[PDB]
Amino acid sequence: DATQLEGAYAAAWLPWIMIPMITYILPFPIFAIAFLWIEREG
Amino acid sequence: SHSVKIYDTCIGCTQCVRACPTDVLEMVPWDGCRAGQIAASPRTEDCVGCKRCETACPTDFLSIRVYLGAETSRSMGLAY
Amino acid sequence: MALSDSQIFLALALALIPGFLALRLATELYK
Amino acid sequence: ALTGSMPKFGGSTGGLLTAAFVEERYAITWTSSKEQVFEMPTGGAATMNEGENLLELARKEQCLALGAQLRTKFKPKITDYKIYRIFPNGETTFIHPADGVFPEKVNEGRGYSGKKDRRIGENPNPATIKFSGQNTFETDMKS
Amino acid sequence: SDAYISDDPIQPYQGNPQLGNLATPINSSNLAKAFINNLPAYRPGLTPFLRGLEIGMAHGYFLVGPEVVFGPLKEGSHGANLSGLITAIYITVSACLGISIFALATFQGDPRGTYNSHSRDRLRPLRKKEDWYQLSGGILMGSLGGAIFAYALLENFELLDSILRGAVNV
Amino acid sequence: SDAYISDDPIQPYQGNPQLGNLATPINSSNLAKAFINNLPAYRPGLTPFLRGLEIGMAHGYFLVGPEVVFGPLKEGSHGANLSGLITAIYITVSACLGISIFALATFQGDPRGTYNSHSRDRLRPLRKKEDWYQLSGGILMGSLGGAIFAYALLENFELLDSILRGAVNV
Ligand code: CLA
Ligand code: CLA
Ligand code: CLA
Ligand code: CLA
Ligand code: CLA
Ligand SMILES: CCCCCCCCCCCCCCCC(=O)OC[C@H](COP(=O)(O)OC[C@@H](O)CO)OC(=O)CCCCCCCCCCCCCCC
Ligand SMILES: CC1=C(/C=C/C(C)=C/C=C/C(C)=C/C=C/C=C(C)/C=C/C=C(C)/C=C/C2=C(C)CCCC2(C)C)C(C)(C)CCC1
Ligand SMILES: CC1=C(/C=C/C(C)=C/C=C/C(C)=C/C=C/C=C(C)/C=C/C=C(C)/C=C/C2=C(C)CCCC2(C)C)C(C)(C)CCC1
Ligand SMILES: CC1=C(/C=C/C(C)=C/C=C\C(C)=C\C=C/C=C(C)/C=C/C=C(C)/C=C/C2=C(C)CCCC2(C)C)C(C)(C)CCC1
Ligand code: SF4
Ligand code: SF4
Numbered sequence: 006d007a008t009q010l011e012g013a014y015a016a017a018w019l020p021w022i023m024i025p026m027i028t029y030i031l032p033f034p035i036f037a038i039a040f041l042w043i044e045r046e047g
Numbered sequence: 048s049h050s051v052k053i054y055d056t057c058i059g060c061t062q063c064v065r066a067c068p069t070d071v072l073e074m075v076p077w078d079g080c081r082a083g084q085i086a087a088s089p090r091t092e093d094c095v096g097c098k099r100c101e102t103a104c105p106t107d108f109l110s111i112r113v114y115l116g117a118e119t120s121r122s123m124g125l126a127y
Numbered sequence: 128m129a130l131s132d133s134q135i136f137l138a139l140a141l142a143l144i145p146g147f148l149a150l151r152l153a154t155e156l157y158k
Numbered sequence: 159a160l161t162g163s164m165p166k167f168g169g170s171t172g173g174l175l176t177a178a179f180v181e182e183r184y185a186i187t188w189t190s191s192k193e194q195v196f197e198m199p200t201g202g203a204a205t206m207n208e209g210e211n212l213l214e215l216a217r218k219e220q221c222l223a224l225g226a227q228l229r230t231k232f233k234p235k236i237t238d239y240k241i242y243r244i245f246p247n248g249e250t251t252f253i254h255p256a257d258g259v260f261p262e263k264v265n266e267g268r269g270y271s272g273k274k275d276r277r278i279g280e281n282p283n284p285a286t287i288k289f290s291g292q293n294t295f296e297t298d299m300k301s
Numbered sequence: 302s303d304a305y306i307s308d309d310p311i312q313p314y315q316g317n318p319q320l321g322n323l324a325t326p327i328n329s330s331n332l333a334k335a336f337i338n339n340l341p342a343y344r345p346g347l348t349p350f351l352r353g354l355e356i357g358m359a360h361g362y363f364l365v366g367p368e369v370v371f372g373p374l375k376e377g378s379h380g381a382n383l384s385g386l387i388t389a390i391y392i393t394v395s396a397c398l399g400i401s402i403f404a405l406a407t408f409q410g411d412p413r414g415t416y417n418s419h420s421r422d423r424l425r426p427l428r429k430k431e432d433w434y435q436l437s438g439g440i441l442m443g444s445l446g447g448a449i450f451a452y453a454l455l456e457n458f459e460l461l462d463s464i465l466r467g468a469v470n471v
Numbered sequence: 472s473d474a475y476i477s478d479d480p481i482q483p484y485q486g487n488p489q490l491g492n493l494a495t496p497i498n499s500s501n502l503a504k505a506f507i508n509n510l511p512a513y514r515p516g517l518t519p520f521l522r523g524l525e526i527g528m529a530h531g532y533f534l535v536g537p538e539v540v541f542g543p544l545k546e547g548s549h550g551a552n553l554s555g556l557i558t559a560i561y562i563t564v565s566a567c568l569g570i571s572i573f574a575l576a577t578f579q580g581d582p583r584g585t586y587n588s589h590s591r592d593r594l595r596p597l598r599k600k601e602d603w604y605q606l607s608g609g610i611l612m613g614s615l616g617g618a619i620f621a622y623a624l625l626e627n628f629e630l631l632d633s634i635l636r637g638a639v640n641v
Contacts (some may be wrong), residue, residue, distance in 0.1 A: 019135065075269060177414075
């Protein structure tokens with residue numbers, strides 16, 4: 006029946022790439038950008 | 048740095064100066080009380096904020112107040 | 128009836144307007 | 159530039175770290191009449207030499223804790239200690255005693271540096287110094 | 302009386318008893334120093350890129366294994382080696398992004414702490430940001446290469462096994 | 472009368488109205504500068520090798536795709552990914568040969584144009600030939616690695632697909 010993740014909805018390939026980007030690809034760049042922002046010197 | 052303020056209810060008992068672990072306080076001549084002395088806080092860049100000076104004060108209310116302010120590496124008591 | 132792929136892509140493209148308006152308001156409020 | 163033998167001590171993990179050499183170090187010098195054991199403010203027991211001793215510590219509070227130990231835990235008292243602040247360029251600054259007496263006594267010439275002629279319960283109440291920058295004790299009036 | 306008057310195995314660090322360390326056999330013996338001081342982080346004379354390259358090779362190599370044996374793909378050989386390879390790749394890229402942003406944040410004017418010009422830390426010898434960027438590039442290159450070398454040895458384990466048993470001499 | 476008497480959004484470049492540029496929102500806003508000045512070509516402090524390494528990684532990665540989808544081998548997965556990989560490899564080696572010969576021809580004595588010692592170009596900061604050779608080596612290393620990383624992700628697309636659908640948790 007459900008051997009893997011599926012989408013019975015329109016553009017069901019979008020979770021497949023959106024969950025990696027939002028959750029483990031773009032976050033460490035965002036953390037690096039915020040760390041460089043809070044540690045930059047006057 | 049913290050702000051240590053001394054008010055005119057001071058009686059020059061020196062107990063705040065003796066209780067300071069970091070030597071912020073000293074006694075200066077006043078002629079505003081009969082001891083002839085009043086506390087002063089010039090080296091308030093050294094103040095850690097322990098408020099031992101306030102615990103040592105006998106006047107009600109206190110003649111010395113410490114206001115914890117901007118934290119530096121000296122007021123945080125950091126040996127690292 | 129169910130939504131189409133083009134209806135999801137319209138949403139994705141149209142949310143770029145609040146997405147960059149939000150960035151403009153965030154930088155106008157000056158961190 | 160500072161005179162004195164380092165006290166006889168085996169070393170500890172409680173001593174100087176990076177911040178000693180990149181921010182500031184303190185030194186305390188004192189003269190003892192005999193070679194005798196004191197407690198390091200960093201933990202442990204060291205031996206002060208007969209004569210002039212010089213010890214580098216990380217904080218001014220450690221130098222003042224040692225000095226309070228010297229003048230209270232020893233008979234005769236050691237009251238001639240001097241505390242200096244050492245900067246990373248090597249610059250040494252004599253800080254304690256700031257005058258040359260001892261803060262607990264009263265010297266003619268020190269000068270007021272925290273005095274506020276008030277009575278605490280009459281600071282300006284905060285509604286009036288809102289968008290000013292001053293906060294309630296760094297002011298000049300009395301309400 | 303006895304405080305540094307008898308000569309013991311544990312000495313003050315660098316002969317200074319007011320330093321916050323002790324000279325114990327683990328940080329001061331000839332074997333411990335000969336091992337540590339010749340590790341790529343501390344080997345004398347090396348450029349930061351070569352230090353980082355050797356650190357990365359050694360690191361990306363062993364980082365493949367934990368997910369090959371324990372990962373979600375462990376029931377099958379090919380997927381297990383791929384999951385270990387991409388885990389090593391991700392950990393390498395995250396660690397090198399951290400090295401780069403450490404160098405970016407630390408070396409701003411005269412740095413604070415051990416990378417200040419007045420610092421006496423013997424255990425942190427990369428004093429310049431150029432050293433840190435060369436190290437980051439080297440660790441990235443070496444670690445990604447060592448990870449794919451471990452991956453290639455695990456993918457061809459059937460061949461490497463038949464070789465090391467002499468099964469190729471028929 | 473009105474020529475630089477009213478204060479407009481478009482200013483002279485660097486406050487100099489006799490320079491051949493204008494300060495528009497695309498070359499002078501805080502968002503545009505924050506993006507461009509922190510790109511690896513312009514990020515402050517970086518060694519040329521690390522600049523080139525990150526440029527190459529990003530570049531060799533996307534250069535695999537056009538031939539995978541559109542190439543002569545596109546009717547089959549394995550050959551399409553191989554044609555994309557070798558296209559990225561060839562474009563990388565050609566571009567880095569060009570970087571090397573640009574540095575070889577330009578930096579001869581005092582160079583002419585923007586790499587002359589008197590040049591004021593803010594947009595071309597690799598003033599030395601050593602910077603250009605370190606950049607060429609880094610772009611080559613990073614681009615060949617990013618190309619084979621994209622190739623390895625496309626070869627194992629069946630596995631990466633079953634992973635990202637949770638099909639490996641049976
Ligand atoms: C209703 C929500 C709200 C609103 C209207 C504001 C509005 C404002 N904030 Mg803010 N803020 C918020 C929520 C909000 N904040 C929350 C929940 C936090 C805690 C994280 C903060 C922490 C914060 C700080 C430290 C500062 C502000 C500041 C400001 C002012 C300047 C604008 C700005 O820089 O953006 C705000 C900057 C941010 C970074 C907002 C954080 C956005 C979210 C919460 C972070 C989530 C990150 C997440 C891990 C993403 C990673 C994954 C990714 C791939 C999706 C402005 C008036 C700045 C100021 O000048 O004060 C006057 C200032 O420096 N805020
Ligand atoms: C704030 C409302 C909101 C919330 C809580 C979510 C939550 C979610 N979305 Mg969704 N989304 C939203 C609005 C929202 N969405 C809108 C308005 C659109 C139309 C463009 C979409 C389009 C969208 C797609 C295509 C997908 C999701 C998906 C998801 C799921 C995974 C996370 C993700 O991939 O993000 C992806 C987000 C986007 C592509 C655009 C997000 C735009 C919103 C408006 C940002 C909201 C910012 C917020 C207001 C600021 C808060 C500040 C801070 C303090 C938190 C998650 C349950 C995934 C899913 O379905 O999982 C199975 C999926 O792939 N969303
Ligand atoms: C969770 C912990 C964990 C787990 C599950 C593993 C799992 C694994 N490790 Mg690993 N490892 C770990 C922690 C772990 N390790 C730690 C903490 C270290 C110390 C840093 C190591 C160091 C290590 C090394 C050096 C090797 C492994 C190898 C392996 C693989 C076993 C051999 C094999 O499958 O094929 C059989 C073996 C082969 C097919 C190759 C045989 C080895 C060749 C002939 C020589 C390798 C070069 C050699 C290291 C050069 C030395 C350089 C210099 C020091 C002289 C396996 C998947 C091996 C491997 O990765 O295979 C590719 C391997 O060589 N591990
Ligand atoms: C520390 C506790 C712990 C341990 C041992 C594990 C272990 C494991 N987890 Mg788990 N996990 C944990 C906590 C833990 N988890 C928590 C708190 C959560 C959230 C609730 C999860 C959520 C989670 C999920 C969703 C999954 C796992 C999975 C796994 C498995 C593979 C993951 C892996 O190998 O990563 C890689 C490990 C490394 C890259 C490095 C390992 C550390 C090395 C070995 C240290 C070696 C030090 C060395 C000895 C010192 C050297 C000394 C020197 C002198 C040489 C593995 C058996 C996966 C699985 O499929 O299960 C089978 C999986 O999908 N975990
Ligand atoms: C002719 C134009 C053209 C064509 C035909 C393609 C075709 C392709 N592109 Mg490409 N691309 C193009 C132009 C083009 N591109 C341009 C102009 C850019 C901007 C520079 C990109 C940037 C780009 C990226 C970033 C990626 C692609 C990918 C792909 C492949 C699609 C996904 C896939 O097959 O498997 C499905 C996807 C996967 C198997 C991997 C999923 C992505 C993982 C989870 C994360 C990737 C790492 C991420 C980029 C890290 C970000 C770093 C930093 C920015 C934060 C495909 C062959 C993907 C790819 O190459 O796959 C290897 C991909 O990741 N393209
Ligand atoms: C939600 C989908 C995925 C999220 C990924 C992106 C998340 C945000 C990434 C942050 C990059 C911004 C860097 C600003 C860089 C910049 O321009 O600096 C501007 C300002 C300070 O800049 P300075 O004045 O120092 O600029 C000087 C130099 O730039 C040159 O003079 O920084 C901020 O305002 C921080 C506040 C931003 C707060 C952001 C939160 C608002 C949410 C925005 C939503 C974005 C959606 C975009 C896609 C539609
Ligand atoms: C402390 C000690 C110990 C330990 C040790 C250890 C920890 C180990 C190890 C180990 C290891 C961990 C090793 C490693 C390694 C490695 C290697 C050997 C590498 C490599 C590589 C390569 C060769 C790569 C290549 C490449 C590149 C780079 C590019 C492209 C791709 C390729 C693949 C080609 C003991 C106790 C025992 C004793 C002694 C001392
Ligand atoms: C402007 C902009 C944009 C765009 C962006 C883009 C254009 C993108 C992209 C992207 C990309 C294009 C990305 C990339 C990447 C990459 C990577 C991630 C890499 C890698 C790699 C690796 C990891 C490699 C490795 C190796 C080596 C080196 C050696 C040996 C082999 C191997 C494989 C291991 C938008 C509008 C959206 C928004 C924002 C801004
Ligand atoms: C264009 C195009 C496209 C694409 C699209 C895409 C790829 C996208 C994306 C994306 C998206 C869809 C996005 C978005 C967004 C974001 C947002 C929407 C946001 C937000 C937020 C907010 C609202 C903010 C808030 C705040 C404030 C206010 C301040 C600060 C703090 C905070 C952060 C809290 C298509 C093909 C379809 C169509 C054609 C063309
Ligand atoms: S708060 Fe502590 S350190 Fe500060 S003046 Fe009072 S007693 Fe001295
Ligand atoms: S303890 Fe109080 S009353 Fe005594 S000298 Fe100090 S401030 Fe004055």
